[PDB]
Design an enzyme around this catalytic site. Structure first.
Site, PDB file in Angstrom:
ATOM      1  N   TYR A 244      -1.350  10.933   2.822  1.00 50.98           N
ATOM      2  CA  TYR A 244      -2.256  11.302   1.717  1.00 50.98           C
ATOM      3  C   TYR A 244      -2.335  12.800   1.498  1.00 50.98           C
ATOM      4  O   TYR A 244      -2.928  13.229   0.512  1.00 50.98           O
ATOM      5  CB  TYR A 244      -3.696  10.837   2.019  1.00 50.98           C
ATOM      6  CG  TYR A 244      -3.921   9.341   1.986  1.00 50.98           C
ATOM      7  CD1 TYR A 244      -4.198   8.685   0.789  1.00 50.98           C
ATOM      8  CD2 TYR A 244      -3.936   8.593   3.158  1.00 50.98           C
ATOM      9  CE1 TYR A 244      -4.451   7.313   0.757  1.00 50.98           C
ATOM     10  CE2 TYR A 244      -4.201   7.223   3.140  1.00 50.98           C
ATOM     11  CZ  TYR A 244      -4.464   6.590   1.937  1.00 50.98           C
ATOM     12  OH  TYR A 244      -4.713   5.246   1.919  1.00 50.98           O
TER      13      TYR A 244
ATOM     14  N   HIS B  40      -7.267  -6.551  -0.580  1.00 50.92           N
ATOM     15  CA  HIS B  40      -6.273  -5.496  -0.346  1.00 50.92           C
ATOM     16  C   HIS B  40      -5.231  -5.856   0.714  1.00 50.92           C
ATOM     17  O   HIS B  40      -4.086  -5.449   0.579  1.00 50.92           O
ATOM     18  CB  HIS B  40      -6.949  -4.157   0.005  1.00 50.92           C
ATOM     19  CG  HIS B  40      -5.963  -3.048   0.207  1.00 50.92           C
ATOM     20  ND1 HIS B  40      -5.621  -2.611   1.485  1.00 50.92           N
ATOM     21  CD2 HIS B  40      -5.209  -2.387  -0.697  1.00 50.92           C
ATOM     22  CE1 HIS B  40      -4.712  -1.676   1.311  1.00 50.92           C
ATOM     23  NE2 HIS B  40      -4.420  -1.511   0.018  1.00 50.92           N
TER      24      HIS B  40
ATOM     25  N   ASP C 238       0.844  -1.200   0.000  1.00 49.36           N
ATOM     26  CA  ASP C 238       0.000   0.000   0.000  1.00 49.36           C
ATOM     27  C   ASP C 238       0.888   1.264   0.000  1.00 49.36           C
ATOM     28  O   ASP C 238       1.701   1.403  -0.918  1.00 49.36           O
ATOM     29  CB  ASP C 238      -1.054  -0.080   1.144  1.00 49.36           C
ATOM     30  CG  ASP C 238      -2.043   1.058   1.152  1.00 49.36           C
ATOM     31  OD1 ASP C 238      -2.982   1.027   0.326  1.00 49.36           O
ATOM     32  OD2 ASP C 238      -1.809   2.043   1.900  1.00 49.36           O
TER      33      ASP C 238
END
Ligand SMILES: NC1Cc2ccccc2C1
Ligand SMILES: NC1Cc2ccccc2C1
EC number: 3.3.2.10
Lengths: 546, 546
Positions: free
Chosen positions: A465, A523, A334
């Site tokens: 982010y 995921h 990730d």
């Protein structure tokens, strides 16, 4: 009513028995039946072998004593030993050929998981051979799976002497009737039986396991494939490196060999690698499983700029400098997968090899703003919800147990939508207040993440982010480069955000790219399909990293 | 008035210059003078070499671009390149042959010690060659000694462009007049000079250092031999392993390669190995410098029995198990030296090799009580003063700074008597309240030990001496064994307690024993003669451990 299981090493947990070799040598060298066998047991309780098993002498001191016994056994036998004879060489390869009896280990593991107290009771020696590491590694691997390891040479008692059985019972804090004892040598079973202990003569594993299953009432034979060994946090070595006055990085460390640095994603932990850490260490690597900046025991400064990729990468370089590592293999997932490609692009000298789970390498678009690039994909809409400081934190920090139970789910268990999450006003809008426990995690594992996230919350993790524009500008400096160091891209079939198709053009930037693919994998690759992840990484490490 | 020193890498801190190789190749291959040199600089600021130095491309991408330039330079030259030509192979060995210019590094180290801000300013590349680790190791070693490392490929600017000089000045937070700049290339010195920076053209090191010494007024040339690199505690990786519910072990970790476990004596710290840790890591080893049970950040339980040798050794085995190490080389000093011989005797499978400083291996006397054995030697009378719980603690804990200043002294500085210490009523009876600072330690180093000992005091450390009878009984089980794994005994001439003569009969128990001897060395071997200790250990590790 049983509550303890005791296993012998030679012939039970480890195969082929080193004992079997003496009979094999005799017939391979056309020597009289039982001759080498006689030399090994000569003098009985006052003989060299008993002194060795009691710890009075080492294996190296014993070798010439056994050799002499081989000569004395020939005088009486009226036959001669041939020229190039070495007891050392026979034992060296016997010990080296001996490997863990995996189905016997799995049965012991299954009994312990059901609440049994497990132990290894063995007649062994003090190994000081130049080649002793082989057996040290085997003992090291086996011992971690048992409550006790009782070695004759450490306790100064041997099987069949009755005192070792009383020592075993006292160590176990169990009545003989509560104990099942497995051994390949009848003479060593007999004293355990006299105490009233349940005994199993082990010839072939299946029959021994059939007897064990019948006597315990627990399924050990024909069971589903077990999960790889996981990590107990309190049994790990915890490391701390100050990378700059206000930033300290925490990691868990296991094994020896080339350095393998594990980099988790959002919102994870070093613990997300729990199934890989023991497997990679066992495969001959030194594993460093990180708590990335903003997570767990690592520093979590509040400023958004502290989490831009350039700063994160520089800190990982400082981390290597402070540990005295000129290189490490970097394996990410990730957000960690993103950092890992960027480590390869900006610091190839410090990166031995690079691997990513789910996260592809997509070069920055010099003609499109990162926000416009997010516009191009409906899957990445949750990233816009993460932009506003406080919003996502409030929702994620509100109920921690709900947060992890809702997020950590296999492909077919999803209770959450990643679409119009901003329109819905959160990613837990369509979700239950009390999510069901996913088949991927135990309640205990969720609670670990809860306690980790109680220290700093989601601000630092969400800040990864929040540097899209800074990351884009920095990445544009690498637009003329290629990744030419060993690289692995592992795709996960059912990852609906980091889809395999997103990795399709990677060969244009990484021509020598190696691939891995995991079917029926969501995921959370590491916990979803641990056995497969380990198999792909170990195979690639042994071929490209080593 | 100068306060900063800036150094180039190629031709200044590292020799021979990779640049020198292109002229050497031409004359070795009888090629026209300057031909390879032309191909390297082709296109100037828009050329492949400038793109490489700016970080636009990697070294591997650059290799075919330089090769093409070599062909174009031949078209004009009207000469031909011979068959087996490889730019890669020329650069591979040029980079590999390049080593640290030790006298230039020492001068930089001396300037920093006097308060200067030091930096490396270099035109370099992003190295993605299969052989990149060699240079990664060199950069790793050099960088730790400077305040800043400015690499052209990271900053996207190159020498001679004026912007890198303004970038350097801003990084330094210094006016040009406060800065001395050293370079081997005249063209790269010129922009620094224009700003008013003091510049040195580096041809031969001695002349460059002569110019540097003249201009700074600090002695750099003909200086006494420097001490090895020491450890700054806050710049180390700190590790923590729980060995049992109430016992946690702390260690400092540096380097990659075979595990080397450092075991201090009484009353010390992992810090006692500060001069060995960087040296052994640099020599290709993974150093684990322990805080032994009872010391520093390691657990210090109050019970005497928690410190018997059998328990201490079992805990060190658990420590290896938890870190996933099948073996480690064990190097001890004083009480650590004792533990280390006992690790070799009881766990040879876990010990790759064993080394001791000052502490000999003397087998327990089955016919003499340990107390009677202490009677046999006047040097060991201080051990009787240590027997009574509270007595020695009170004296040692009363004034910590006095305790360490009085104890940590070179052979000819002693202010203390080890005789009739019980009769005198303490080891600080004949000593000043304010001892002078020994030439072995700075005030800062004493203060480190003071802060460490403030956590648990002397109870745990003194308990190591309180299990004589238990240790004796346990040791008697090994009376028939020999140490047959690689072993090193290092004797210290001036150690008046652990005298070299005490080691004389060791070959009877360790036939293959290797030796080391240090003259003019007191009890505190590691800090007394660090350069020699490092030389003996590195040589023995490379020959017997690796
Ligand atoms: N594609 C942009 C988004 C991002 C995130 C991290 C590092 C580089 C870049 C470039
Ligand atoms: N010589 C005895 C004193 C001592 C100290 C530590 C370990 C063994 C022994 C035997």
């Amino acid at each position: 009513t049983l509550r303890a299981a005791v296993f012998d090493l030679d012939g039970v947990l480890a195969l082929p028995a080193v004992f079997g070799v003496l009979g094999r040598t005799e017939e391979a060298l056309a020597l009289p039946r039982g001759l080498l066998n006689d030399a090994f047991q000569k003098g009985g309780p006052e003989g060299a072998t008993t002194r060795l098993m009691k710890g009075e002498i080492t294996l190296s001191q014993w070798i010439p004593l056994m050799e002499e016994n081989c000569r004395k056994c020939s005088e009486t036998a009226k036959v001669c030993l041939p020229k190039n004879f070495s007891i050392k060489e026979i034992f060296d390869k016997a010990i080296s050929a001996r490997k863990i009896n995996r189905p016997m280990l799995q049965a012991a593991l299954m009994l312990r998981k059901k609440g049994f107290t497990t132990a290894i009771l063995t007649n062994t020696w003090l190994d000081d051979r130049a080649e002793r590491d082989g057996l040290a590694q085997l003992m090291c691997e086996l011992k971690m799976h048992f409550d006790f390891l009782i070695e004759s040479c450490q306790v100064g008692m041997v099987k069949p002497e009755p005192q070792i059985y009383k020592f075993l019972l006292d160590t176990l804090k169990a009545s003989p009737s509560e104990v099942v004892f497995l051994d390949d040598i009848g003479a060593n079973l007999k004293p355990a039986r006299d105490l009233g202990m349940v005994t199993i003569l082990v010839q072939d594993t299946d029959t021994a396991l059939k007897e064990l299953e019948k006597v315990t009432g627990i399924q050990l034979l024909n069971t589903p494939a077990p999960l790889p060994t996981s990590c107990n946090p309190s049994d790990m070595s915890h490391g701390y490196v100050t990378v700059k006055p206000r930033v300290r990085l925490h990691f868990v460390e296991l094994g020896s060999g080339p350095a393998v640095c594990l980099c988790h994603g959002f919102p994870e932990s070093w613990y997300s690698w729990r199934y890989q850490i023991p497997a990679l260490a066992q495969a001959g690597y030194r594993v460093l499983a990180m708590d990335m900046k903003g997570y767990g025991e690592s520093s979590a400064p509040p400023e958004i700029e502290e989490y831009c990729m350039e700063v994160l990468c520089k800190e990982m370089v400082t981390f290597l400098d402070k540990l005295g590592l000129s290189q490490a293999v970097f394996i990410g997932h990730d957000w960690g997968g993103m950092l890992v490609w960027y480590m390869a692009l900006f610091y190839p000298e410090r990166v031995r090899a690079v691997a990513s789970l789910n996260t592809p390498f997509i070069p920055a678009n010099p003609n499109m703003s990162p926000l416009e690039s997010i516009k191009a994909n409906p899957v990445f809409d949750y990233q816009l919800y993460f932009q506003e400081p406080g919003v996502a934190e409030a929702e994620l920090e509100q109920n921690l147990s709900r947060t992890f139970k809702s997020l950590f789910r296999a492909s077919d268990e999803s209770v959450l939508s990643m679409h119009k999450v901003c329109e819905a006003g959160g990613l837990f809008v369509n979700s239950p207040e009390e999510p069901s426990l996913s088949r991927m995690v135990t309640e205990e594992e969720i609670q670990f993440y809860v306690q980790q996230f109680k220290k700093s919350g989601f601000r630092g993790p969400l800040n990864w982010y929040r540097n899209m524009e800074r990351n884009w500008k920095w990445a544009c400096k690498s637009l003329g480069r290629k990744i030419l160091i060993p690289a692995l891209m592992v795709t996960a079939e059912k990852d609906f955000v980091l889809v395999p198709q997103m990795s399709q053009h990677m060969e244009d930037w990484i021509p020598h790219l190696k691939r891995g693919h995991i079917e029926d994998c969501g995921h959370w690759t590491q916990m979803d399909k641990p056995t497969e992840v380990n198999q792909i990484l170990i195979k690639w490490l042994d071929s490209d990293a080593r």
